[PDB]
Design an enzyme around this catalytic site. Structure first.
Site, PDB file in Angstrom:
ATOM      1  N   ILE A 155       0.831  -1.200   0.000  1.00 45.52           N
ATOM      2  CA  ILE A 155       0.000   0.000   0.000  1.00 45.52           C
ATOM      3  C   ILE A 155       0.864   1.247   0.000  1.00 45.52           C
ATOM      4  O   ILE A 155       0.574   2.202  -0.729  1.00 45.52           O
ATOM      5  CB  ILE A 155      -1.027  -0.027   1.153  1.00 45.52           C
ATOM      6  CG1 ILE A 155      -2.053  -1.124   0.900  1.00 45.52           C
ATOM      7  CG2 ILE A 155      -1.680   1.361   1.329  1.00 45.52           C
ATOM      8  CD1 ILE A 155      -3.058  -1.317   1.979  1.00 45.52           C
ATOM      9  N   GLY A 156       1.906   1.265   0.806  1.00 44.92           N
ATOM     10  CA  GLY A 156       2.627   2.504   1.019  1.00 44.92           C
ATOM     11  C   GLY A 156       3.741   2.374   2.021  1.00 44.92           C
ATOM     12  O   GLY A 156       3.992   1.300   2.559  1.00 44.92           O
ATOM     13  N   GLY A 188       6.549   5.117   4.615  1.00 37.14           N
ATOM     14  CA  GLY A 188       6.907   6.406   5.195  1.00 37.14           C
ATOM     15  C   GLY A 188       7.950   6.204   6.274  1.00 37.14           C
ATOM     16  O   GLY A 188       8.513   5.121   6.361  1.00 37.14           O
ATOM     17  N   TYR A 214       7.561   5.799   9.390  1.00 27.25           N
ATOM     18  CA  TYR A 214       6.997   4.756  10.268  1.00 27.25           C
ATOM     19  C   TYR A 214       7.384   3.312   9.871  1.00 27.25           C
ATOM     20  O   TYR A 214       7.452   2.434  10.737  1.00 27.25           O
ATOM     21  CB  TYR A 214       5.454   4.881  10.329  1.00 27.25           C
ATOM     22  CG  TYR A 214       4.754   4.431   9.060  1.00 27.25           C
ATOM     23  CD1 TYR A 214       4.514   5.318   8.018  1.00 27.25           C
ATOM     24  CD2 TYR A 214       4.396   3.102   8.872  1.00 27.25           C
ATOM     25  CE1 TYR A 214       3.921   4.895   6.834  1.00 27.25           C
ATOM     26  CE2 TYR A 214       3.841   2.659   7.670  1.00 27.25           C
ATOM     27  CZ  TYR A 214       3.578   3.567   6.664  1.00 27.25           C
ATOM     28  OH  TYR A 214       3.020   3.131   5.475  1.00 27.25           O
ATOM     29  N   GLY A 215       7.596   3.059   8.580  1.00 28.33           N
ATOM     30  CA  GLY A 215       7.844   1.720   8.082  1.00 28.33           C
ATOM     31  C   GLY A 215       7.078   1.496   6.806  1.00 28.33           C
ATOM     32  O   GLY A 215       7.038   2.391   5.951  1.00 28.33           O
ATOM     33  N   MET A 216       6.463   0.330   6.673  1.00 31.18           N
ATOM     34  CA  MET A 216       5.764  -0.046   5.446  1.00 31.18           C
ATOM     35  C   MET A 216       4.425  -0.638   5.754  1.00 31.18           C
ATOM     36  O   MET A 216       4.282  -1.366   6.739  1.00 31.18           O
ATOM     37  CB  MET A 216       6.590  -1.066   4.657  1.00 31.18           C
ATOM     38  CG  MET A 216       6.055  -1.342   3.265  1.00 31.18           C
ATOM     39  SD  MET A 216       7.065  -2.552   2.321  1.00 31.18           S
ATOM     40  CE  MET A 216       8.418  -1.496   1.779  1.00 31.18           C
ATOM     41  N   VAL A 217       3.431  -0.355   4.893  1.00 33.49           N
ATOM     42  CA  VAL A 217       2.106  -0.892   5.081  1.00 33.49           C
ATOM     43  C   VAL A 217       1.673  -1.671   3.854  1.00 33.49           C
ATOM     44  O   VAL A 217       1.894  -1.220   2.724  1.00 33.49           O
ATOM     45  CB  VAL A 217       1.073   0.205   5.518  1.00 33.49           C
ATOM     46  CG1 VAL A 217       0.796   1.211   4.402  1.00 33.49           C
ATOM     47  CG2 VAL A 217      -0.223  -0.424   6.004  1.00 33.49           C
ATOM     48  N   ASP A 262      -2.025  15.169  16.843  1.00 31.60           N
ATOM     49  CA  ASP A 262      -1.570  15.237  15.478  1.00 31.60           C
ATOM     50  C   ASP A 262      -2.719  15.025  14.488  1.00 31.60           C
ATOM     51  O   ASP A 262      -2.587  14.331  13.503  1.00 31.60           O
ATOM     52  CB  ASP A 262      -0.371  14.325  15.256  1.00 31.60           C
ATOM     53  CG  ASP A 262       0.457  14.648  14.037  1.00 31.60           C
ATOM     54  OD1 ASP A 262       0.397  15.813  13.557  1.00 31.60           O
ATOM     55  OD2 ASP A 262       1.167  13.744  13.557  1.00 31.60           O
TER      56      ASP A 262
END
Ligand code: RYW
Length: 347
Positions: free
Chosen positions: A21-22, A24, A26-29, A139
């Protein structure tokens, strides 16, 4: 194990048929097929253990989301990690799979006034629950608002959240801050640590403005430019509001500025519903003490088609962190993440 764009995804045997999916900081999804519930799910691979800030965000989110249970708040369904602290290098957080987010939707779609209404309602309904637990999200922004194909909305990313602490909110002028710039209340740059519920109302205000025009209302290009943008629309603060700023650096900065008139909402948003603009004005109040609270916002005429306080649930009790997390080393935080994810292990 399955690989996705050069990353192991060790989520089996329960989760298969992964698709990127994506990605950033944060890591990977991925999406994955869940072989127990026979539904596709979201899986995010987090690898936080070399970064105290990453461990903090991972632990706050996990603790908060496993406690909270609300229709407008993303759940955690499952957490996958290694059986020992020694072997645990990654944490996989399994969540309901959503079709899109409000950031993506605002870049590609005009929202009808009825969609804006429904989205704002769901945001405030989720926020009522979060604030009722004495928690601040801290946030809120379009990319943290997940949507499904029928426009049901869920708030995500609780890794910046804190317990509210209004008695310790005061700080100095231009004191450094982590949350996302275009959604930062004016008082963050002036005298506030962002430890009161009014920080979140400001962000929701910004979101509402952005839903009306598909453009962020206060797109500061950098840190002190953010206040320039805010004051550019709100105009000069009143004597009364200025007198609430007791810190002299902040006071005298504001006094040094030329007089600016308020830009009226109906000129910035000529096609907007008048009731939407009235609520918007109340959410984007300069003085955080005068800013509308979440329950009052839900009770506002603009939301009358949806308002039902009996169907806007609150948390069973206030949320508390057992220990203060910001002065814990990443090694202790890893221990706490291990403990907190133990309920998803076989056994
Ligand atoms: C440096 O930063 C860090 C370091 C950490 F150690 C930990 C974090 C954590 C906690 O703070 N933060 C996040 O994980 C934030 C950043 N994100 C990323 C993320 C991606 C996808 C989905 C998602 N997406 C969908 N669907 C998508 C929607 C768009 O359109 C495509 C389909 N569905 C279900 C879900 Cl949970 C949710 C999130 C989410 O919460 C951050």
């Amino acid at each position: 194990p399955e690989m996705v764009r050069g990353q192991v995804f060790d989520v089996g045997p329960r989760y298969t048929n992964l698709s990127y999916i994506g990605e950033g900081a944060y890591g990977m999804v991925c999406s994955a097929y869940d072989n127990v519930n026979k539904v596709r799910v979201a899986i995010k691979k987090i690898s936080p253990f070399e970064h105290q800030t990453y461990c903090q965000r991972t632990l706050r989110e996990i603790k908060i989301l496993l406690r909270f249970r609300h229709e407008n708040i993303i759940g955690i369904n499952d957490i996958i990690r290694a059986p020992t602290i020694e072997q645990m290098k990654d944490v996989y957080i399994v969540q309901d799979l959503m079709e899109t987010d409000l950031y993506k939707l605002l870049k590609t779609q005009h929202l009808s006034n009825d969609h804006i209404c429904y989205f704002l309602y769901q945001i405030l309904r989720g926020l009522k629950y979060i604030h009722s637990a004495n928690v601040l999200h801290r946030d809120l922004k379009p990319s943290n608002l997940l949507l499904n194909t029928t426009c049901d909305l869920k708030i995500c990313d609780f890794g910046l959240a804190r317990v509210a602490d209004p008695d310790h909110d005061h700080t100095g002028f231009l004191t450094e801050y982590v949350a996302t710039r275009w959604y930062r209340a004016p008082e963050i740059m002036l005298n506030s640590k962002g430890y009161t519920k009014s920080i979140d109302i400001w962000s929701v205000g910004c979101i509402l403005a952005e839903m009306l025009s598909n453009r962020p209302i206060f797109p500061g290009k950098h840190y002190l430019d953010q206040l320039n943008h805010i004051l550019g629309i709100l105009g000069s603060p009143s004597q009364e509001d200025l007198n609430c700023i007791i810190n002299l650096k902040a006071r005298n900065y504001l006094l040094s500025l030329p007089h600016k008139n308020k830009v009226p909402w109906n000129r910035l948003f000529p096609n907007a519903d008048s009731k939407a603009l009235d609520l918007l004005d109340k959410m984007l109040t300069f003085n955080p003490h005068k800013r509308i609270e979440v329950e009052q916002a839900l009770a506002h005429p603009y939301l009358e088609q949806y308002y039902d306080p009996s169907d806007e649930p609150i948390a069973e009790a206030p949320f508390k962190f057992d220990m203060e997390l910001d002065d814990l080393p990443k090694e202790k935080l890893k221990e706490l993440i291990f403990e907190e994810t133990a309920r998803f292990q076989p056994g």
